[PDB]
Every structure is written in structure tokens, then in C-alpha cells.
Amino acid sequence: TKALRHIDARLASRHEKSVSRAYGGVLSHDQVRDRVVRAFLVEEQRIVKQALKEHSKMKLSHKRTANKKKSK
Amino acid sequence: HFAARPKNFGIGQDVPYARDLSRFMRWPTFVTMQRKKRVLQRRLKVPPALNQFTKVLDRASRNEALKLIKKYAPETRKARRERLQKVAEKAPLAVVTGLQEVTRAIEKKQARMVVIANNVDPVELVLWMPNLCRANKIPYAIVKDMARLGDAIGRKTATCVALTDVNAEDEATLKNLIRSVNARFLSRSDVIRRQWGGLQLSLRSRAELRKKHARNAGVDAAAIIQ
Amino acid sequence: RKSYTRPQFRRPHTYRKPAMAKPSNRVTVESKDIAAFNVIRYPLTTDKAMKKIEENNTLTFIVDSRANKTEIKKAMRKLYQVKAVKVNTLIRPDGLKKAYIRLSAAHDALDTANKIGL
Amino acid sequence: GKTVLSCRKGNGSVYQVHGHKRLGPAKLRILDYAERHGYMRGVVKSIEHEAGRGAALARVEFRHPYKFRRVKELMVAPEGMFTGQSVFCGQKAPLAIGNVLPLGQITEGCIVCNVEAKPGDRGTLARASGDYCIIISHNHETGRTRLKLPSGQKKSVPSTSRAMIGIISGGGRIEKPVLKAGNSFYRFRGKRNCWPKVRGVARNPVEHPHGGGNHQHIGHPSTVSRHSPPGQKVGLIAARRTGRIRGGKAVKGAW
RNA sequence: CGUUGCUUCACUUAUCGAAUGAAGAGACCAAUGGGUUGCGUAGUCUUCGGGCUAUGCACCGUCUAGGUUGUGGGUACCCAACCGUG
RNA sequence: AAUUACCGAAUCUUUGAACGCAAACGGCGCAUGGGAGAAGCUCGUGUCAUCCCCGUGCAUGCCAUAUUCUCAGUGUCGA
RNA sequence: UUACUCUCGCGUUGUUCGGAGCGGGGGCUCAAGAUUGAAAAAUGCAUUGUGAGUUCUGCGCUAAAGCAAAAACCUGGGGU
RNA sequence: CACGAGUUGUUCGGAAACUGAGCACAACGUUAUAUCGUUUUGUUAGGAAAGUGAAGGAACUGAAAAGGGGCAACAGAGAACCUGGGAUUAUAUUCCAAAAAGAAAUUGCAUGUGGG
Ligand SMILES: [K+]
Ligand SMILES: [K+]
Ligand SMILES: [K+]
Ligand SMILES: [K+]
Ligand SMILES: [K+]
Ligand SMILES: [Mg+2]
Ligand SMILES: [Mg+2]
Ligand SMILES: [Mg+2]
Ligand SMILES: [Mg+2]
Ligand SMILES: [Mg+2]
Ligand SMILES: [Mg+2]
Ligand SMILES: [Mg+2]
Ligand SMILES: [Mg+2]
Ligand SMILES: [Mg+2]
Ligand SMILES: [Mg+2]
Ligand SMILES: [Mg+2]
Ligand SMILES: [Mg+2]
Ligand SMILES: [Mg+2]
Ligand SMILES: [Mg+2]
Ligand SMILES: [Mg+2]
Ligand SMILES: [Mg+2]
Ligand code: NA
């Protein structure tokens, strides 16, 4: 990205103030990589935790029915 | 390919929809004051003279009385002009309207029934009329809204209406109405003159008191002998 | 009842009838053809003014001090049937406004000066 | 006579706060529904210095609870807070340095700062650098909490009031001698027009009760009544005692 | 029996302090409540139309999270009751 | 009558209570009615974008009014 | 990239830097200059090489003192 | 002292059009008396101060968005132009006329050409 003053920035082409990569002209290449990795890994941990909670509840209710059928 | 995409609306989580904020917004001053006035009037202790206007007549009797008044409503300007022109080339029997004329009718003991609105402001205009009617032994009723009386007689509002004479086609209706009115108002004079009003707690205070009584229950059982 | 979604009450939007045009309060008679005579007052004949006529095809006038360059161009066309390509103005130290008016090449300033009477 | 300087300062004029460089008031979050029932999580973005204040300030970013935007808060930073740290505020927040919790949820014997005297006041006690308050006890029947203040006094506050865990950053400031008049000049430049100080006995009788005389001396006792009018209440105001303190020092203030 | 002086305990509507862009109060978990915009019992009055004082039964008046009981695409409930209180 | 005297018809620049907004600025607006227009369009005419010029209305408060104008209120009713 | 194995290496006048990636090979980009030409000889008057000075710029950014704000403009995230 | 003359801008400075230390119109309150007080710590006033984007069949009609209207810097922010002249008695980055001595930059609105 070039360093342009007020009038120069307005009349210049869009290439000179940006980059084809995502968040171009706002974030550097290493900051983009950090956000991409963070988005995937944090979301994945939520999925693992979410499925763990449901199964623990799921296996708990099955035992109740099994205990119910055993008694009756 | 269509699927459901539910939104989580817990603390944090997704941005919620726009919920109703009527009960917590800042209203205009006159709105706030006209609500607080009713609250204060309920909370304070009301003397019998003011309290008597809170207890009103039954809906069916009110409807019958308004029907009779509308039947005997006074003439309009066009009707009066036409009648005057016809006689040129006395007004028919009607009700008595207007504070001065109604008061004169009551004082001269010409009225057979009196109807008084319960929401006149300032209230000093009609605060004494039930007492005057009781002293003269004249049947009277206190009904809801001066707007209904005004609509019955043909105007915007009306403070009081007096019935003095009625045809034979409605004499029996008038007698039944007099009986009902006397049952509600004139027979209960002692209770009306002795009964106070007000002293009403709010719903929140009532619920708080109930829960406090429920919580502090049975803690003194051990002090009872045997 | 109605539902409100903002924490404070604002004035509702109501119908507004537009205002009507009244009869004009000024009734003096004004003429359109007279206006150009007010803009241009009279020419100058000083030594500096005369040199510009021969060497720059330019005329010099005293004009209304509240007039602008655009109006002066139009008045010149309406009064003398010439086209002005450039107008420069200044306000003199005595309070009057002076204008150097350069004519187009199609016209001759000297010929126009003779018609005026310089 | 003429008006005394202490009374003249009450008009304002050239004796007001120099606040052009300041960043704004420092306060906690607004006590809202999320704070009363759950918790909110924010991120510390920067730690900065403000002219006239000895403690560091922190900028903390939260999400708006009702709209799509970000909210920035300026708070007094406890010691140890760092950029990128997560801050939890609310009823269900865990017990850690930097979090904001209701006083009823904090274990007895804990060290706190930025304490609300009244619920929703957004922090009024224990804010100067290096200061803190100590939790003494709870009363569940009355719903109140007892605190020991930096001055040594003890105060009872509603248990709904909030507090931040830790101590205020920047402690140890007053241990370094100043050594120069210019350093005091720069110190008070950021605060106000109150330095240097001229002694009362060095003035003339027209301006001060202590002025005048062929020697520099006060001719009457310097302890004055609580009922003295303005312009007469100078010196040691309503002093219970004077002189060097022997033995332990009592706790200052009213009963 | 009455009235009036001080007081201590409970309350909230005057008033005071604070905060907020007046941004989510309280209840539904039920009376020492309210209702003619209801039904009985016992007294006690009545201008005979019906009231008042105690006392019972209805109506206002209901909901709920959670807890207890070889790769791809899917299934794994309902109980009803207590605890809890959005 | 470039005489005088008096008076009924007229003109009356920028301001000022000054009142569209401001002001050591002959400055800047909204609505409406006009004017001029060497571009472009069209058959020396007509028409006209951007720019320019002129007239009128537009402060705050209060009173009356609306062939009966448009609305708000967990104020009081009613269906 | 066994670069710091047993005195590790690169670098400034200068107060230091490296497995959170030094040094070497090859590259991408920014800032300040240099060079070739159009302007431009048609103008002006009647030549291209070194030392000294010079705050534009670069060397990225005392303190209990830590160094204004906004209009205007630029880019992106979503959506069309 | 007398008479007669002289100051030329799309780009230079200001305004149109920024904000600062600050001021105080409206609003509210006070005073026998407004010629008094509050009025930037995001900000007036017990406080109903938003007047048009799209639309929808060519002018209408109304959704959205909390916190009234201004002023205060000719050294702060902002700002599209340069040289030559034999061009004055006195002005010039303001004057020069078809070989403009000439070479540029920029704003508004329209007409082709190309692409979509
Ligand atoms: K009311
Ligand atoms: K000083
Ligand atoms: K002395
Ligand atoms: K002395
Ligand atoms: K209503
Ligand atoms: Mg000029
Ligand atoms: Mg201040
Ligand atoms: Mg002396
Ligand atoms: Mg003295
Ligand atoms: Mg001495
Ligand atoms: Mg003394
Ligand atoms: Mg004006
Ligand atoms: Mg090494
Ligand atoms: Mg002289
Ligand atoms: Mg002279
Ligand atoms: Mg203030
Ligand atoms: Mg300011
Ligand atoms: Mg303001
Ligand atoms: Mg400047
Ligand atoms: Mg300029
Ligand atoms: Mg000179
Ligand atoms: Na500041």
C-alpha cells in the first residue's frame, strides 16, 4: 500500500491502497492467518463439548428406562 | 434443501429481536401524572362523602334508565324552529337538564327521579346533590360517565338529569326503575353515610405480604403448652 | 395497545397542510428593459484606459458596485451587441467599482469606442 | 479587611481543574439485566496513563446486549491486568483478579477495589493507587456486608453492591523524595492551581487572621471552633488534640 | 368504656439520595386479597326493591429451563409427580 | 414657470424592536413565482441542463378558528 | 536451519539482536534518491567534477511531566 | 500645498465548509424587577424539539435512526498554477489573445466512442 495524501488518495486506483487477500488494506498477512486458525479451532472445541453433554444426558435417561423395566 | 436455523437468545449469544418496552420507557409528563393521580387516589383514605360516588348502579338498570332518558330527550334547534313557525302560522313533555333547573326541580319537589354522573370535575358541583335528594325524599341514582348522559340527551356531557312526568306507556317502567334505584341507593342511607373508602395495597405489596406470612409460619409452635 | 421498542417517547408523525401563496405585497411597476442601464454607468477616458483599447481590445467602465461579473457580461451584450470573453473588476479607493472588459476577437474595441463616442 | 484566599477559591475562576488532557471519568459497567442475572465477557485492549492520576487506566471492549455494535469502557486498572486479558462481569462471574462480582458472592476475607457504596453507583471507594478494601463479614438476614476501608474505618453496605477483585495499580508512588521545586511544579501542572503555598503569618492583617506584627507570630490560639464563619475558620479546625502523637495513632474521622 | 400526650414495631403513597439513552418490576409457587361492570349458613336491619356483620364454596387464576425418579448421511422417546424460579 | 405657499395622490437605498440563519463576512439557506441564457436539442427562430439575477413567505410567545384538519394517553367509558 | 559447541554468530559513533527463527542463496514490497525522454529553445544571459555549511528527510515511533480534537477522505466485513 | 491619476485572480488570503480554551439564543427556574442562573465529565429542556430513503400506483404518502439552534483560529486542521515578458509614471504566481510567450491542474453539467 502506498502513502498518499488527501487529494492523491481520492484519485488513485484501488490497487494502490489494498491487496487481493481477505481483509486487505486493514490487516497484515500474519494477523489474517491468526484469525483463520482461531475461528476453526475455537468452534471445533464447542462442538466436542456440546456432543459430550448431550450423550451424558442421553445415556442417563436410558439407564432410567432400564431400571424402570427391571423393576416392572 | 430448506432447513431450520434456530437462534440462541440467552445471555450473550445472538442479537435479540426488538422486545416491547412500553412498561419501562419514559412517557410524557401528563401521561405519567394522570396515572399517578389514580394510584394516589386509591392509596389514600377517602371520606364517605367522596366515597359514595365510587359505588354505582347496576349495568342493566343503567341501560334501562338511559333508554328512557333518550326516549324523553329534548327537542333540537331545527325542531324548535319548525314548531315555532307552525304555531306562528308549549314544548312537548321532556326531561329537565342543566344544573340550575335540576336543582330547582328538586327543591320544589317536582322531580320523580334524578340521575347523577359519577365523574364530574370539579367534584364540588354535585357533591351535595345526593344529600339534597335524601333530605327531600326523592329517588336518585349515581351512574357512570357524564358522556353517556350527554349522548342520551343530545349533547357532549351532562352533570345531572331529572324526570318529572312520563306518559302512561312508560309509567310502569318508571315505577320499576324507581324500585330498583331505591333498593340500591335510598334504602342504604345509613351505610352510605357511615362507610369510608380507600386503603388499598398494590399487587406487589399484597404478594410480598402473603409470601412473608407463608415464610414466617409455625416458628412459634414450640411456645404452645401441650 | 401499541408496542414501543425505544426507551423514550418521541412525537408522532401527523398530517401537515402546506402553506398557501399570498397576493404580492409589492405593487410598484418595474420594467425589464430598464435594468441594463443601471448596471453600466459610464466609461472612463484616462491614459491607462486608452492604452488598453488599442493594445488589448479592452474597454473600461464604471459599474454598479453591487453587480457581479456574470451580470456585467449580459448587460454588455444587451447594450452594445458585443461578446465579452473576460471581465476583471475592482473597487476603487473612492468607493466606486471599475471593470476591465475584454472583447472577443470578432469585434474591435476601437470601433465600439467610436460608436459610444470616446 | 479583604477576602481570604480559601474563601476566594470557592468562586471557581482560575482555581478549577486542568482537564484538557484527561480521557474522561473512570467507572464500571452499567448495572443491567445481563449483569444482574448472568455475566458479560470483555477484552482488555489497552492500558494507558492519564494526566493528574497516579493509577493506570484500562480500556475494555464488550458487545452491546441489544444492538449490533461494540461498547468501550474506561476503568481503573488493578495491578496485574494485561492487554488481551478476558474480564467477566456479573452475578455468575468466577473469582479471579480483574473480575467484577456482587459483594454477596465474594468470600469473607477477600481483598477488593472499586467498591460501590450504593448499588449502581459504578464505583466510588478504594480507587487511589495501591489502595484496597477488606471484606469482614456477611449478614444474610439483613442482606448486608461489612468492609474495612483504607482509612481504617468500617462500613456496612448492601450485598447487591459490586466490587472488583485485586488492588489498584501504581502502588508505592509516595516513597520517592521529590528533591526539587520544579518537580512539584510539574506534578501540580496536571492537577490545578494550588502551588506554591504562602504561610499565613507572612501576609498582612488585611488579608489573613494570622498576618501582621513586628514579629512573625500568631497572637491567639490556632485551634478554631466548628461554628466559626467563613473567613475566620483558618488554622486547626475543631481539633480534638494537638502536638506529636505518642503511642498508637487513632483512626481519623467522625464517629 | 371514650378521648388525648408521648413512645417501638410493621408498612408505603408524601418527601429525600443515587443510577439509567427512565432497557426486561412483581406474580403465575396464591392470601391476614379483589369482584354486583356469583352461590349457601347464622345473626341483624329494611323505604319490602334488598342490604350489613361473621362464615364457608366458586371466579379473577396459567406457562416454564434445569435436577430427581473405509468414508458420508440418520435413530435413540413419552411418563406423571416433587425440587427450582425465569 | 428649476417662481413661491399649502396638501389629499405617489416614490422611499443599507440597517435598526429587527423577526429565515449569522456577522470586524455588503455572507449562507428552504418553499414558491418570474428573468436572462454565445452550451446541447430543433426548424436567423423556438426550447433549455449547470451557473447567475429579482419579488414574496419562513423568529418566539399568546388568543380565536378548522363546513368541522391530522394525532397521543396501562385517564374515564362503551361495544 | 546441529544456528549457541563450551571462548556461538551478525551489526551501530551509540546505550543489542537471534529456535517466539541469527547468518547465507533467491525473491515480494515501501520510502528517499539517481538515470532516459516530453516540456525546452522557440526561453534567459551576453560547465562539470571535488571539499565545508545547511533540518527537507531517514535512522519507527528529565518524567509523581508520558506530549489536542473534529470536518473531509481511504479501505475492509456483511448484503444486493 | 494644488491639479490630475493608480490597486485587475477558477488555483494567492478569507468566507462558503473543521474543531479548541471558551461564549450564551432557545428551554426551564429564580427575582418586587431579567439587564440573573444553568447551558461538553456525550452534550439542552418534567423532556411529545427527527418532516423524508425507498416506495405504491407523478405529484403525493411515510420507515429508519436517543441527547434543540449557533458562534469562537488571516500562525492549529484544510487549500486544484508554474515559468518567461521590450508588461506600468504607479499593480501583478492577478496583466499578455490564435503561433493566447506558453505549459498545466481541478469543479459542475451535457454530447459522442468503447465496454457492460
Ligand atoms: K387521572
Ligand atoms: K500558582
Ligand atoms: K500576627
Ligand atoms: K513583616
Ligand atoms: K385509551
Ligand atoms: Mg478581485
Ligand atoms: Mg471542569
Ligand atoms: Mg511583609
Ligand atoms: Mg482581620
Ligand atoms: Mg520565624
Ligand atoms: Mg482571632
Ligand atoms: Mg436578521
Ligand atoms: Mg548460533
Ligand atoms: Mg496633502
Ligand atoms: Mg486627489
Ligand atoms: Mg457544567
Ligand atoms: Mg468547547
Ligand atoms: Mg448544544
Ligand atoms: Mg493555517
Ligand atoms: Mg486559497
Ligand atoms: Mg510597488
Ligand atoms: Na479531555
Query: Would you list the DSSP string of D52-76?
Result: T-SS-EEEEEEE-SSSSSEEEEEEE
Angle value at C-alpha A70, between A66 and A71, nearest 5 degrees: 120
Q: CA C92 → C1' H10, Å?
A: 23
Chains D and B touch (3+ CB pairs under 8 A): yes
Please answer whether residues B161 and B153 qualify as being in contact, where contact means their C-beta atoms are separated by less than 8 angstroms.
yes
Compute the nearest-CA separation of B7 from chain C (Å).
20
Please answer whether residues B72 and B166 qualify as being in contact, where contact means their C-beta atoms are separated by less than 8 angstroms.
yes
Name the grid cell of A12: 488513485
Compute CA D150 distance to the chain's CA centroid, rounded to the nearest angstrom. 10
Can you tell me the distance from the alpha carbon of C83 to that of C98, in angstroms, rounded to the nearest whole number? 18
Handedness of CA C65, C71, C74, C75 (dihedral sign): negative
Can you tell me the distance from the alpha carbon of A19 to that of A32, in angstroms, rounded to the nearest whole number? 12
Name the grid cell of C57: 481590445
Chain B stretch 8-67, residues whose beta carbon is closer than 8 A to a beta carbon of chain C: 18-22, 24-28
User: Residue-wise over D174-187: b if at least 16 C-beta within 10 A, else e?
Assistant: eeeeeeeeeeeeee
Compute CA C32 distance to the chain's CA centroid, rounded to the nearest angstrom. 14
Cis omega before residue D78 (within 30°)?
A: no
CA distances from B104 to B111, B136, C47 (A): 9, 12, 107
Dihedrals phi, psi of D228, to nearest 5 degrees: -65, 140
Please answer whether residues D60 and D45 qualify as being in contact, where contact means their C-beta atoms are separated by less than 8 angstroms.
yes
Of the candidates D188, D215, D218, D179, the one whose C-alpha atom is nearest the C-alpha of residue D200 is D218
CA distances from A19 to A37, B86, B95, D30, D132 (A): 20, 98, 91, 41, 50
Q: CA A10 → C1' G58, Å?
A: 27
Dihedrals phi, psi of D184, to nearest 5 degrees: -65, -40
Give D217's DSSP letter. -
CA distances from B65 to B104, B112, B153 (A): 21, 13, 12
Ion ligand 9 neighbours (CB, 5 A) are: D 1
Resolution of this model in Å is 2.4
Cβ of A34 near strand G (under 7 Å)? The reply is no
Name the grid cell of D9: 477559591
Can you tell me the distance from the alpha carbon of D108 to that of D138, in angstroms, rounded to the nearest whole number? 7
- H or E segment and range at residue D196: none
Please answer whether residues D36 and D92 qualify as being in contact, where contact means their C-beta atoms are separated by less than 8 angstroms.
no
Ligand 22 center–CA D165 separation, angstroms: 29
Helices (H), A1-72: 6-11, 29-71
Task: Say whether C6 and B26 touch across the interface (CB within 8 A).
Answer: no
Can you tell me the distance from the alpha carbon of A41 to that of A48, in angstroms, rounded to the nearest whole number? 11
Can you tell me the distance from the alpha carbon of B13 to that of D75, in angstroms, rounded to the nearest whole number? 25
Compute CA B122 distance to the chain's CA centroid, rounded to the nearest angstrom. 15
Please answer whether residues D113 and D138 qualify as being in contact, where contact means their C-beta atoms are separated by less than 8 angstroms.
no
**D126 CB neighbour count, 10 Å cutoff:** 23
Please answer whether residues D185 and D145 qualify as being in contact, where contact means their C-beta atoms are separated by less than 8 angstroms.
no
In D, which residues are within 8 Å of B11 by CB distance? Answer: 34, 37-40
Dihedrals phi, psi of D241, to nearest 5 degrees: -160, 165
Which chain G positions come under 7 Å from a protein C-beta?
30-31, 63-68, 72-77
**D115 CB neighbour count, 10 Å cutoff:** 24
- H or E segment and range at residue B181: helix B171-184
- H or E segment and range at residue B150: helix B146-153
Among B15, B20, B24, the strongest candidate for a mutation testing the C interface, having the largest count of C CBs within 10 A, is B20
- Where does residue C91 rank: exposed (0-12), middle (13-18), buried (19+ CB within 10 A)? exposed
Contacts of D86 (CB under 8 A, 6+ apart): D41, D42, D43, D44
What is the C-alpha end-to-end distance of chain B, expressed in Å?
Answer: 76
The nearest alpha carbon in chain D to B18 belongs to D66
Cβ of A52 near strand G (under 7 Å)? The reply is no
Can you tell me the distance from the alpha carbon of C32 to that of C37, in angstroms, rounded to the nearest whole number? 11
Among B17, B26, B35, the strongest candidate for a mutation testing the C interface, having the largest count of C CBs within 10 A, is B26
Question: Which one-letter amino acid corresponds to residue D103?
Answer: L
Of the candidates B159, B153, B160, the one whose C-alpha atom is nearest the C-alpha of residue B122 is B159
Please answer whether residues D91 and D35 qualify as being in contact, where contact means their C-beta atoms are separated by less than 8 angstroms.
yes
Can you tell me the distance from the alpha carbon of D250 to that of D239, in angstroms, rounded to the nearest whole number? 14
Contacts of D158 (CB under 8 A, 6+ apart): D103, D118, D119, D143, D144, D145
Q: Per this entry, what is the length of chain D?
A: 255
Task: Say whether B24 and C8 touch across the interface (CB within 8 A).
Answer: no
User: Residue-wise over C20-49: b if at least 16 C-beta within 10 A, else e?
Assistant: eeeeeeeeeeeeeeeeeeebbeebbeeeeb
Q: Per this entry, what is the length of chain C?
A: 118
Dihedrals phi, psi of C86, to nearest 5 degrees: -160, 135
Cis omega before residue B122 (within 30°)?
A: yes
Quickly tell me which residue has 466436542 as its cell: A48
In B, which residues are within 8 Å of D40 by CB distance? Answer: 11-12
